Symmetry: C2
Subunit: 405 residues, 2 copies
């Protein structure tokens, strides 16, 4: 940076901090990643500078000829990535992407069927403190109590019982492949629309490592920042038939001027995802997650669903008599970042939990491989199995620092 | 840029374009401005990298110690700037800032009283194609047919008649000072809350050139990008009493993870606004707008409300028998960017209009002064008074290029 350090030492110090922290810690928060310098340069550009309400070639302001090129690049690279008929790259976030689909297809009070929030469903899928649960009538389907795999029979009974206008599939804490074909078949049974929120698995979908929801869903929403490793923001994919309504839901519907600099970073991240090495990267993400899961079970940990099909895993800490809140704090003491996360049928409340959610997308980006996964699992074992030992904690800290350089 | 040009020539070319366009054109869109390099460097940082749902010291993720410093800097610089009891610097946009206040104070279907959309009220103030007008019952107050000044008697009658739960003051196309004390007095008369959307005038408010709404309103919303010259995003200011509810409206209410890199650019823009030269700059903005208004009237143009008290002006083109759509296109032909904009009591529809909206915040940022204002008005006169003359247009183009270097 050149001008920031001189103009704002305080903000620059905190940023420099955050940068060093990102390097020093072992980042295991499943929704995180590290973007590339080109993505950051696109967001730090003068595109931040333009009002561009409307869409390419149909703007409400003159002078949009060049930001229209950037948006169309993003839209077209998305279409290439996911095969969707239409993309809207304006959502300011995953939340806004979900909110626009709900604005489009639902009337206030309508019934929506989503994944149980304590089984993997996201906040934007019906939490009662969230707009989604406040505006609409959300009902949930759950995972099997023993396999922790979505119970498709439960999805179907719930759809048939409650007759939702919309069915939402996908999650923020579900370690197994989701069967989009089954959800769509149930939606058609009850005449509901199908929305897939692939935020967590978008990069895996882009790399062919997770079934693509695009051909099954009427709408697909996602963040551009998790496994897709783009800037922080959202995107909606949908069939051509809903194209105009989704675009109008985004604007003049729920947003105003779009973030064109972010939309330029989206196009840049999409370009990266279209390359072969992003595919090699995603592959390592999943390989790494499997490796880490295996290694954690080798250490004596129980995993929700017994393992993972994607970038993430959930540790059930009941066997070690730990709450997720406790494990998260002790791991934070040695430089390992995870999230507490409720486990299906959790006896503890959401603010305490019986599990920790872990993902490998960030460490994979930084170059960690299977041997690092083994080490990280051994570190987690030493810590979580010896919570009151300061020597275990010190040893773990030294082993964390050996990993992060 | 270093990595963008190599990794993504297509996106880099379009960005480089947009940068050159910004320099070559005479940017008169009233909501635009140019941010500083330090603001851009903060948005192009690794802060983009962190999940930070929740607020400083009350996050839902570990590792937020340094992004909490950046957020608290933004919040505290905002509080210093505007004198508000609480700031929420997470709104992703002016739209999201307004949406969170509406989520907080209103139940679906509630009555809200806002400024007539064709008299200066914004889209997020009740447009029927907007979430605001779809979710709630919006009623409007207008400006006087001859002075084009908000009719406070009309505001009061409308409040007393419709008994709104909320009253919204401010606008995207109102060239005169708004009387926040009168709005609050009316709100108290009918027991309504008072929301001031100062997006357009925030920088003028920050510089003491526009009465501050903070002491009169229960809630104040704004974009961080217009006269405030920050990155593109929103902010909500409010009394301490609504602090928790507004924060919860933002999260877990209507958004998800905040844009911490943008929040760092907000703090940087707030730091700039706190300096003396930002005050000198705002002063020039208003001086320039007055100058330009005067000069336009010298050329024979009628201005809505007969002039301006702020950064913006509205030309009523009926005297020249032009629609705003036509004037916007002919000005675009010579390198001058404006917006068509309905004028109060406009005979034309919103897609055609009888006026052009103009502001001086961008050209002032670039250094234009009173002599440039005189020249720009002379250029606009030559063009709009000789629409079918190609020689007038060519002459204007040369005079535009003399201004932009
Ligand atoms: C499946 C899923 N969908 C939407 C979002 C919201 O995205 P924002 O950009 O944050 O609005 C999420 C977010 N997930 C976060 C926690 O909410 C995470 O760490 O998983 C999501 O998971
Ligand atoms: C008064 C006012 N309030 C909110 C907004 C919305 O902000 P976003 O960041 O764009 O969501 C605006 C926006 N004004 C734009 C046109 O909508 C402008 O050019 O005035 C606003 O004016």
């Amino acid at each position: 940076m050149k001008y920031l350090p001189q103009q704002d030492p305080q903000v620059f110090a905190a940023i420099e901090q955050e940068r060093k922290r990102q390097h020093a810690k072992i980042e295991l928060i499943a929704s995180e990643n590290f973007v590339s310098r080109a993505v950051m340069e696109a967001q730090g550009s003068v595109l931040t500078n333009k009002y561009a309400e409307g869409y390419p070639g149909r703007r409400y302001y003159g002078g949009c000829e060049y930001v229209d090129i950037v948006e169309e690049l993003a839209r077209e690279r998305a279409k290439q990535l996911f095969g969707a008929e239409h993309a809207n790259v304006q959502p300011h976030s995953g939340a806004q992407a979900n909110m626009a689909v709900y604005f489009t297809v639902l009337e206030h009070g309508d019934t929506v069927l989503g994944m149980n929030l304590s089984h993997g469903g996201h906040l934007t899928h019906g939490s009662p403190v969230n707009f989604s649960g406040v505006q609409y009538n959300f009902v949930a389907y759950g995972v099997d109590p023993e396999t922790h795999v979505i119970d498709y029979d439960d999805v179907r009974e719930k759809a048939r019982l409650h007759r939702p206008k919309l069915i939402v599939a996908a999650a923020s804490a579900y370690p197994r492949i989701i069967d989009f074909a089954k959800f769509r078949e149930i939606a058609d049974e009850v005449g509901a629309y199908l929305m897939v929120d692939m935020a967590h698995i978008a990069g895996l979908v882009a790399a062919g490592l997770h079934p693509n929801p695009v051909p099954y869903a009427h709408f697909v929403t996602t963040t551009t920042h998790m496994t897709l490793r783009g800037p922080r923001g959202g995107m909606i994919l949908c069939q051509e038939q809903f194209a105009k309504q989704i675009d109008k839901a985004i604007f003049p519907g729920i947003q105003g001027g779009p973030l064109m600099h972010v939309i330029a970073a989206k196009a840049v991240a999409f370009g990266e995802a279209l390359q072969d090495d992003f595919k090699a990267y995603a592959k390592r993400v999943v390989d790494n997650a499997k490796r880490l899961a295996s290694a954690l079970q080798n250490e004596g940990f129980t995993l929700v669903s017994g393992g993972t099909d994607n970038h993430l895993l959930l540790v059930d800490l009941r066997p070690q008599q730990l709450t997720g809140k406790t494990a998260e704090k002790v791991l934070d003491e040695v430089g390992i970042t995870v999230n507490k996360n409720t486990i299906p049928y959790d006896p503890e409340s959401p603010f305490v939990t019986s599990g920790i959610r872990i993902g490998t997308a960030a460490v994979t980006t930084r170059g960690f491989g299977l041997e690092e996964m083994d080490e990280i699992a051994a570190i987690i074992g030493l810590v979580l199995k010896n919570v009151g030992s300061e020597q275990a904690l010190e040893e773990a800290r030294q082993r964390v620092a050996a990993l992060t350089d």
